[PDB]
């Protein structure tokens, strides 16, 4: 079973769950079935198909740490979610998404616009409202001054649910 591997850099957070399934809280925001195989149970270590056709894999895990750390903001599952596929220097050569010079001087190298292509659509189905123009500006700057993952919800009794 192929698999992405964990950076190790930050402390041991509880993280525990089944083979599968994002939290009640992720499910009230979108309830339109954004890649079901998040809500199937398969097997953490288990790549998926990203967006059907672009061929672009992601391990299970990772894309549950994404949502788990975005859960409530679209700009960070598009760091995290492009961060998970750019891991070595090929964004710290390259001017990020449309791949072109910031100088009269060859320094760069290819970029995989394939892999942006399906992050940036991914992440506006997570977000209808949510412009590339946020978007190629994001993937060019890839820097952050804060973790802001204390998203703190509760959402007492939204478990229940009207009858169809």
């Given at each position: 079973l192929p698999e992405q591997v964990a950076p190790e850099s930050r402390n041991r957070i509880r993280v525990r769950?089944?083979?599968a399934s994002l939290p009640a809280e992720l499910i009230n925001q979108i309830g339109n079935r954004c890649h079901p195989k998040l809500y199937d149970e398969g097997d953490p270590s288990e790549k998926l198909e990203l967006?059907?056709?672009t061929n672009v894999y992601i391990t299970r895990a990772q894309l549950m740490n994404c949502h788990v750390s975005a859960g409530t903001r679209h700009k960070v599952l598009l760091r995290r979610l492009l961060a998970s596929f750019f891991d070595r220097n090929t964004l710290a050569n390259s001017c990020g998404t449309g791949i072109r010079s910031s100088?009269?001087?060859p320094r760069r190298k290819p970029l995989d616009s394939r892999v942006l292509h399906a992050v940036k659509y991914y992440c506006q189905n997570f977000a209808p409202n949510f412009k590339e123009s946020e978007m190629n500006a994001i993937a060019a700057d890839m820097c952050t001054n804060?973790?802001?993952?204390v998203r703190k919800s509760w959402m007492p009794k939204?478990?229940?649910l009207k009858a169809e």
């Open positions: 769950q089944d083979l967006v059907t056709g100088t009269n001087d804060a973790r802001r993952v939204v478990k229940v």
